[PDB]
Amino acid sequence: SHMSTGDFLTKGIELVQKAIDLDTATQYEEAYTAYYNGLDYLMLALKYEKNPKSKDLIRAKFTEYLNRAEQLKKHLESEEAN
Amino acid sequence: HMLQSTPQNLVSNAPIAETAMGIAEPPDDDLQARLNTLKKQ
């Protein structure tokens, strides 16, 4: 019922670029949310990608942003408990 | 205090803008597992 016309990869990148700006600004709450939004799009880009070289690059970048988002989350859990 | 230095455990792996540039012109199992964990609460 909806055609999936847009590029999930470039949407994911758009959201990660925003996350990076927020992360740099120490706006970690907002950055964390931006990262996970970006990652949901990159995960779908990965699931549906048919070029193995492209999949390899998407995987490498996904992992990097996921590592960072996980760090932010632990930090926020720490501030929340304290 | 109003301000605090960013903690060293957050500084060290801070992104540079360059990481997300030039990727796209405008194995997966453990990755989806970690994303599932990340989004909760």
From Swiss-Prot, chain A:
Source organism, top-level taxon: Eukaryota
MIT domain: residues covered: 5-82
Subcellular location per the Swiss-Prot or TrEMBL entry: Endosome membrane
Quaternary structure and partners: Monomer or homodimer (in nucleotide-free form). Decamer, dodecamer or tetradecamer of two stacked respective homooligomeric rings (when bound to ATP); the dodecameric form seems to be predominant. Interacts with VPS20. Interacts with VTA1; the interaction requires the dimeric structure of VTA1; 6 homodimers of VTA1 appear to associate with the dodecameric VSP4 complex. Interacts with DID2. Interacts with DID4. Interacts with IST1; IST1 competes with VTA1 for binding with VPS4.
Further remarks about this protein from its record: Present with 5350 molecules/cell in log phase SD medium.
Described function: Involved in the transport of biosynthetic membrane proteins from the prevacuolar/endosomal compartment to the vacuole. Required for multivesicular body (MVB) protein sorting. Catalyzes the ATP-dependent dissociation of class E VPS proteins from endosomal membranes, such as the disassembly of the ESCRT-III complex.
This protein's name: Vacuolar protein sorting-associated protein 4
Native source organism of the sequence: Saccharomyces cerevisiae (strain ATCC 204508 / S288c) (Baker's yeast)
Swiss-Prot record, chain B:
Effect of substituting L31D: Abolishes interaction with VPS4
Annotated segments matching region Disordered: 23-41
Record's subcellular location: Cytoplasm; Endosome membrane
UniProt motif (MIT-interacting motif) ranges: 29-39
Disulphide connectivity of cysteines: none
Region of interest (Interaction with VPS4), residue spans: 3-41
Function (record text): Required for the sorting and concentration of proteins resulting in the entry of these proteins into the invaginating vesicles of the multivesicular body (MVB). Acts a component of the ESCRT-III complex, which appears to be critical for late steps in MVB sorting, such as membrane invagination and final cargo sorting and recruitment of late-acting components of the sorting machinery. The MVB pathway requires the sequential function of ESCRT-O, -I,-II and -III complex assemblies. Can directly stimulate VPS4 ATPase activity.
Similarity section: Belongs to the SNF7 family.
Subunit comment: Core component of the ESCRT-III complex (endosomal sorting required for transport complex III). ESCRT-III appears to be sequentially assembled as a flat lattice on the endosome membrane and forms a transient 450 kDa complex that contains DID4, oligomerized SNF7, VPS20 and VPS24. SNF7 oligomerization into a membrane-associated filament is nucleated by association of SNF7 with VPS20; the process is terminated through association of VPS24, possibly by capping the SNF7 filament. VPS24 subsequently associates with DID4/VPS2.
Protein name: DOA4-independent degradation protein 4
Organism for this UniProt entry: Saccharomyces cerevisiae (strain ATCC 204508 / S288c)
Full-protein positions shown: 183 to 231 of 232
